[PDB]
Design a protein around this ligand. Structure first.
Ligand SMILES: *[C@@H](O)c1ccccc1N
Ligand SMILES: [Ca+2]
Ligand SMILES: [Ca+2]
Ligand SMILES: [Cu+]
Lengths: 303, 14
């Protein structure tokens, strides 16, 4: 990818860049999944051994406070602002808010809301004053790359994201192991109840949670499962990674072309009855200038 | 009925 920016890249020291990041040592892990109920068109498989070079990855998704600092320093205008609208979950749109009649095929719970963007996540009249340490949302893949580059970082590849999210466990279902709520404790912010009609908020949150909510995984990362989808660097495909080759097994970058970029981790809207995509092997995609109330990102860096 | 949708795209509404 060759992005274009209207701000200069500031100088930063290695110690500044590494703050809030964990160092993942070079090594191998088993990427992918073989859950029999996986949508075969997501390409969760095959399970494969991948070798990665050492990298740094953020413990937390990028927060509102951090994104605000980026925008203050650069004047950056997000894709949602240029388009003038972004996607908000229906239950979060305040009655009377102007809404577009647009329908996302097969997903009528999404509402295109003029004026919804990172600083007004539910549209005009909403704010992030009470959400400084929540993940920034309504950020597109382009916005994420812009932030990451300004910060001296980059987006993780899907394999880097998944190695870090797995937190040192071999082929577990979730970042922490194989039970969704071990010892009856909620470990991530997803949906409980009847999707899309009623979220019971059993896990504490019916929207985003702070980036440091819940216990971390074994590598110190927080909310890799649930909370917000997280953009990764790779172009999406369902089958590029089915090939056995150095390109797909050593520091894999994904296909060289595509139309949508990979997103990982699931969000506060995920539920087993619909999209069971908070499993660490799960994956989906979105087009790179798209944005939504349940999608953000975390950064990676070369040491 | 079809693959569940988690990522709503700007193109999808056109
Ligand atoms: C259709 O196939 C469908 C619809 C809702 C939830 C799951 C599935 N598979
Ligand atoms: Ca929740
Ligand atoms: Ca996540
Ligand atoms: Cu989902």
């Amino acid at each position: 990818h060759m992005p274009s920016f209207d701000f200069d890249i500031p100088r930063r020291s290695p110690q500044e860049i590494a703050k809030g990041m964990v160092a993942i040592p070079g090594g191998t892990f088993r990427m992918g999944g073989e859950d029999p109920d996986a949508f075969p068109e997501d390409g969760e498989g095959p399970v494969r051994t991948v070798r990665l070079s050492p990298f740094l990855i953020d413990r937390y998704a990028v927060s509102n406070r951090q994104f605000a600092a980026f925008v203050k320093a650069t004047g950056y205008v997000t894709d949602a602002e240029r388009y003038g609208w972004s996607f908000v979950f229906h239950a979060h749109v305040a009655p009377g808010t102007p809404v577009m009649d647009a329908v996302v095929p097969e997903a009528p719970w999404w509402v295109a809301v003029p004026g919804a963007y990172w600083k007004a996540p539910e549209g005009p009249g909403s704010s992030i004053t009470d959400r400084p340490n929540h993940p920034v949302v309504h950020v597109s893949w382009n916005d994420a790359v812009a932030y990451a580059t300004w910060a001296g970082k980059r987006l993780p590849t899907e394999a880097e994201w998944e190695m870090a999210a797995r937190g040192g466990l071999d082929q577990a279902r979730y970042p922490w192991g194989n039970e969704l709520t071990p010892r009856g404790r909620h470990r991530c912010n997803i949906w409980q109840g009847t999707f899309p009609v009623h979220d019971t908020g059993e896990d504490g949150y019916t929207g985003t949670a702070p980036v440091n909510a819940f216990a971390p995984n074994g590598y110190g990362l927080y909310n890799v499962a649930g909370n917000v989808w997280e953009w990764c660097a790779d172009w999406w495909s369902a089958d590029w990674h089915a090939t056995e080759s150095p390109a797909t097994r050593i520091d894999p970058r994904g296909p060289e072309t595509g139309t949508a970029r990979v997103t990982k981790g699931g969000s506060f809207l995920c539920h087993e009855s619909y999209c069971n995509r908070y499993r660490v092997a799960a994956r989906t995609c979105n087009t790179p200038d798209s944005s939504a109330a349940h999608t953000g990102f975390r950064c990676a860096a070369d040491p | 009925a079809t693959t569940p949708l988690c990522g709503p795209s700007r193109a999808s509404i056109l």
